[PDB]
Design a protein around this motif. Structure first.
Motif, PDB file in Angstrom:
ATOM      1  N   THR A   1      25.077  22.262  67.330  1.00  0.00           N
ATOM      2  CA  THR A   1      25.476  22.966  66.093  1.00  0.00           C
ATOM      3  C   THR A   1      24.252  23.076  65.192  1.00  0.00           C
ATOM      4  N   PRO A   2      24.199  24.112  64.360  1.00  0.00           N
ATOM      5  CA  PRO A   2      23.136  24.218  63.357  1.00  0.00           C
ATOM      6  C   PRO A   2      23.521  23.577  62.022  1.00  0.00           C
ATOM      7  N   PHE A   3      24.639  22.843  62.000  1.00  0.00           N
ATOM      8  CA  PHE A   3      25.168  22.215  60.792  1.00  0.00           C
ATOM      9  C   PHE A   3      25.666  20.833  61.160  1.00  0.00           C
ATOM     10  N   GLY A   4      25.900  20.048  60.135  1.00  0.00           N
ATOM     11  CA  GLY A   4      26.605  18.799  60.239  1.00  0.00           C
ATOM     12  C   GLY A   4      27.940  18.948  59.524  1.00  0.00           C
ATOM     13  N   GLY A   5      28.837  17.992  59.746  1.00  0.00           N
ATOM     14  CA  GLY A   5      30.151  18.054  59.098  1.00  0.00           C
ATOM     15  C   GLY A   5      30.821  16.712  59.003  1.00  0.00           C
ATOM     16  N   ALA A   6      31.836  16.653  58.159  1.00  0.00           N
ATOM     17  CA  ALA A   6      32.687  15.470  58.094  1.00  0.00           C
ATOM     18  C   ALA A   6      34.026  15.795  57.474  1.00  0.00           C
ATOM     19  N   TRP A   7      35.055  15.171  58.024  1.00  0.00           N
ATOM     20  CA  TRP A   7      36.367  15.131  57.369  1.00  0.00           C
ATOM     21  C   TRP A   7      36.335  13.957  56.386  1.00  0.00           C
ATOM     22  N   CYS A   8      36.649  14.226  55.121  1.00  0.00           N
ATOM     23  CA  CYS A   8      36.545  13.233  54.061  1.00  0.00           C
ATOM     24  C   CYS A   8      37.869  13.078  53.333  1.00  0.00           C
ATOM     25  N   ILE A   9      38.154  11.839  52.982  1.00  0.00           N
ATOM     26  CA  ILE A   9      39.328  11.498  52.190  1.00  0.00           C
ATOM     27  C   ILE A   9      38.904  10.690  51.000  1.00  0.00           C
ATOM     28  N   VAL A  10      39.242  11.217  49.830  1.00  0.00           N
ATOM     29  CA  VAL A  10      39.095  10.475  48.567  1.00  0.00           C
ATOM     30  C   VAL A  10      40.460   9.872  48.282  1.00  0.00           C
ATOM     31  N   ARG A  11      40.526   8.552  48.292  1.00  0.00           N
ATOM     32  CA  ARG A  11      41.796   7.839  48.214  1.00  0.00           C
ATOM     33  C   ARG A  11      42.402   7.989  46.820  1.00  0.00           C
ATOM     34  N   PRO A  12      43.716   7.761  46.703  1.00  0.00           N
ATOM     35  CA  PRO A  12      44.375   7.939  45.399  1.00  0.00           C
ATOM     36  C   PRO A  12      43.699   7.143  44.288  1.00  0.00           C
ATOM     37  N   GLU A  13      43.519   7.773  43.130  1.00  0.00           N
ATOM     38  CA  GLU A  13      42.953   7.122  41.947  1.00  0.00           C
ATOM     39  C   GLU A  13      41.583   6.548  42.204  1.00  0.00           C
ATOM     40  N   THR A  14      40.775   7.304  42.952  1.00  0.00           N
ATOM     41  CA  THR A  14      39.374   6.926  43.180  1.00  0.00           C
ATOM     42  C   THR A  14      38.486   8.146  42.998  1.00  0.00           C
ATOM     43  N   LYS A  15      37.186   7.916  42.985  1.00  0.00           N
ATOM     44  CA  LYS A  15      36.201   9.015  42.964  1.00  0.00           C
ATOM     45  C   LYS A  15      35.090   8.726  43.942  1.00  0.00           C
ATOM     46  N   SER A  16      34.422   9.781  44.414  1.00  0.00           N
ATOM     47  CA  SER A  16      33.317   9.587  45.383  1.00  0.00           C
ATOM     48  C   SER A  16      31.969   9.401  44.697  1.00  0.00           C
ATOM     49  N   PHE A  17      30.942   9.082  45.489  1.00  0.00           N
ATOM     50  CA  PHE A  17      29.610   8.740  44.986  1.00  0.00           C
ATOM     51  C   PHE A  17      28.806   9.976  44.638  1.00  0.00           C
ATOM     52  N   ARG A  18      28.265  10.022  43.435  1.00  0.00           N
ATOM     53  CA  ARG A  18      27.569  11.230  42.969  1.00  0.00           C
ATOM     54  C   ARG A  18      26.187  11.329  43.602  1.00  0.00           C
ATOM     55  N   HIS A  19      25.867  12.486  44.201  1.00  0.00           N
ATOM     56  CA  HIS A  19      24.500  12.659  44.701  1.00  0.00           C
ATOM     57  C   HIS A  19      24.084  14.098  44.625  1.00  0.00           C
ATOM     58  N   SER A  20      22.858  14.349  45.051  1.00  0.00           N
ATOM     59  CA  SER A  20      22.336  15.708  45.126  1.00  0.00           C
ATOM     60  C   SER A  20      21.350  15.789  46.271  1.00  0.00           C
ATOM     61  N   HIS A  21      21.090  17.002  46.741  1.00  0.00           N
ATOM     62  CA  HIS A  21      20.217  17.178  47.898  1.00  0.00           C
ATOM     63  C   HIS A  21      19.767  18.621  48.082  1.00  0.00           C
ATOM     64  N   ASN A  22      18.647  18.776  48.795  1.00  0.00           N
ATOM     65  CA  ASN A  22      18.105  20.071  49.212  1.00  0.00           C
ATOM     66  C   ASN A  22      19.036  20.816  50.165  1.00  0.00           C
ATOM     67  N   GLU A  23      19.825  20.098  50.961  1.00  0.00           N
ATOM     68  CA  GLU A  23      20.619  20.732  51.990  1.00  0.00           C
ATOM     69  C   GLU A  23      21.734  21.577  51.352  1.00  0.00           C
ATOM     70  N   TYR A  24      22.054  22.711  51.979  1.00  0.00           N
ATOM     71  CA  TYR A  24      23.229  23.524  51.657  1.00  0.00           C
ATOM     72  C   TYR A  24      24.479  22.776  52.061  1.00  0.00           C
ATOM     73  N   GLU A  25      25.561  22.999  51.331  1.00  0.00           N
ATOM     74  CA  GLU A  25      26.822  22.314  51.607  1.00  0.00           C
ATOM     75  C   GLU A  25      27.983  23.158  51.105  1.00  0.00           C
ATOM     76  N   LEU A  26      29.061  23.149  51.908  1.00  0.00           N
ATOM     77  CA  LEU A  26      30.369  23.840  51.720  1.00  0.00           C
ATOM     78  C   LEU A  26      31.491  22.786  51.800  1.00  0.00           C
ATOM     79  N   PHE A  27      32.444  22.788  50.867  1.00  0.00           N
ATOM     80  CA  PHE A  27      33.672  22.011  51.040  1.00  0.00           C
ATOM     81  C   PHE A  27      34.810  22.990  51.325  1.00  0.00           C
ATOM     82  N   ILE A  28      35.636  22.628  52.289  1.00  0.00           N
ATOM     83  CA  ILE A  28      36.877  23.304  52.633  1.00  0.00           C
ATOM     84  C   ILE A  28      37.969  22.299  52.239  1.00  0.00           C
TER      85      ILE A  28
END
Ligand code: NA
Ligand code: NI
Ligand code: NI
Lengths: 121, 120
Positions: free
Chosen positions: A31-58
């Motif tokens: 593949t020319p991309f990477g991917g992941a299925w992600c779950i943010v659990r109830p009443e939580t938040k994910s880790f803030r970051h930034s990067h050069n890479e392009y990214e799409l959320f579905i």
């Protein structure tokens, strides 16, 4: 190569303060991309970051806020989010139900590596 | 570039015997792949085809049987399927609930085009 990967929810790896199932590695998959299925659990938040890479959320299931450089985007099933290059981003799930999304990321390196691996095969 | 595209479930486009919402076009988005959100309606099957482009399915909601060549794969939420090159593939939904999946496809052309547009 394996054609199917059945989801094992208990196999997810906790990273970026969420639970993920990375696409790669997958033997025989090029593949020319990477991917992941992600779950943010109830009443939580994910880790803030930034990067050069392009990214799409579905967005797959549930409700959340995607905060991108201190702009908030409420999202739910079906929505698509582009993560601007080098923007700070994280996911806020204030709700009682799991928030699911798939992320796909890519860059010049990942794309060229796809082409290189093809030629080597 | 619009950052967000809210899903408009009233604007799906019927193709491949399913109801879909394609990723592209999206002004300002440069990707080495194409994509679509696909809904196989209850008690239907999608259009069988094959191609020299790589493809994967991300299973989002419901239950289906994915038949790849002569082999049946039951799928449910969370499952990922790779569609082998030049394999005949389609989706069967025997149930009373819509089957949703996202497809991502790519090839040498789509990847080179991403690189070319970058450089431009
Ligand atoms: Na649940
Ligand atoms: Ni990111
Ligand atoms: Ni196909």
């Amino acid at each position: 190569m394996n054609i199917i990967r059945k989801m094992d929810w208990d196999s997810m790896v906790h990273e970026y303060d969420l639970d993920g199932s990375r696409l790669l590695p997958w033997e025989g998959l090029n593949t020319p991309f990477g991917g992941a299925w992600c779950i943010v659990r109830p009443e939580t938040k994910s880790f803030r970051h930034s990067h050069n890479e392009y990214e799409l959320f579905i967005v797959i299931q549930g409700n959340a806020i995607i905060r991108i450089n201190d702009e908030d985007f409420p999202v739910t099933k079906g929505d698509l989010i582009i993560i601007p290059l080098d923007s700070e981003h994280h996911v806020i799930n204030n709700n009682q139900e799991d928030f699911h999304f798939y992320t796909i990321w890519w860059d010049k390196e990942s794309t060229l590596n796809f082409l290189t691996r093809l030629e080597q095969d």
